[PDB]
């Protein structure tokens, strides 16, 4: 679960991400496609090369959805509702993949936010990403 402290930590970290969020989501997808090639199977209709506009574009949407989740941290299951139907029922993304994307976001934030990514905040973001992953995956088979 997300405790008070956890929520504060996530709000301050995402807070400092700011306007750089789309670009971070974009780097996070590139890291994932390269480190864990199996994930590309969900994006065959995409141009997956370095600097691709479709990836940049998609990175932005992934980040906006995460901003919205933080904005509704106390009601995530209803706020991410539409995204859950898409991932679990329309797209049928196997849950392991959420762990890979979550790991890649943590690497991205670690690489860009030296001073804020302390141990405590690291644990919080990890907890938050798991919560978001659970929402997006809970109706899946």
């Amino acid at each position: 679960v997300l405790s008070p402290a956890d929520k504060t930590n996530v709000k301050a970290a995402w807070g400092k991400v700011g306007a750089h969020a789309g670009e971070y989501g974009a780097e996070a997808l590139e890291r994932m496609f390269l480190s864990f090639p199996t994930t590309k199977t969900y994006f065959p209709h995409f141009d997956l090369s370095h600097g691709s506009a479709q990836v940049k574009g998609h990175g932005k949407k992934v980040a906006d959805a995460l901003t919205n989740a933080v904005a509704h941290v106390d009601d995530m299951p209803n706020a991410l509702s539409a995204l859950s139907d898409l991932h679990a029922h329309k797209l049928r993304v196997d849950p392991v993949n959420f762990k890979l994307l979550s790991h890649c976001l943590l690497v991205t934030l670690a690489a860009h936010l030296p001073a804020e990514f302390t141990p405590a905040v690291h644990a919080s973001l990890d907890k938050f990403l798991a919560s978001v992953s659970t929402v997006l995956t809970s109706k899946y088979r």
Binding site: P37, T38, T41, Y42, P44, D94, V96, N97, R141
Partner: protein, 146 residues
């Protein structure tokens, strides 16, 4: 494939008694019923509306036999599954875009089908040997994903 010789021998003997028509259709059939996700890849096969629709579909049955046919080939080649499944791997990756996590599901559904058909003779030790086979096959199918 680290199979002990008494393991290769347990696997071999049981396999010699397998009715592929039944098992291949049952395994493929159960994959799509128990894990409806996997239905997205077989849209060309027709009506998968319901369990009975699924276990009666002759396209599901024929393709199951084919899947079991490839599993028979790797059993006859346990020492080189990677070379044995290389083409199938490129196909599942480059043409069909199947997430390899799905290979474990089919392998385990496949083990429950053998247990269902062999009952008592499918003892824990026989199971463990098959678990090793089924993981080596999954791994071999995933090896050329890039």
């Amino acid at each position: 494939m680290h199979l002990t010789p008494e393991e290769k021998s347990a696997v071999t003997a049981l396999w010699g008694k397998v009715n592929v028509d039944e098992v291949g259709g049952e395994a493929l059939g159960r994959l799509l019923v128990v894990y409806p996700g996997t239905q997205r890849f077989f849209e060309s096969f027709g009506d998968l509306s319901t369990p009975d629709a699924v276990m009666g579909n002759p396209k599901v049955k024929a393709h199951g036999k084919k899947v079991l046919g490839a599993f028979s080939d790797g059993l006859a080649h346990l020492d080189n599954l990677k070379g044995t499944f290389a083409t199938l791997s490129e196909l599942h990756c480059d043409k069909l875009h199947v997430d390899p996590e799905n290979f474990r599901l089919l392998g385990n559904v496949l083990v429950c089908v053998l247990a269902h058909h062999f009952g008592k003779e499918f003892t824990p030790p026989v199971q463990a040997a098959y678990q090793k086979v089924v993981a080596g096959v999954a791994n071999a199918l995933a090896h050329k994903y890039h």
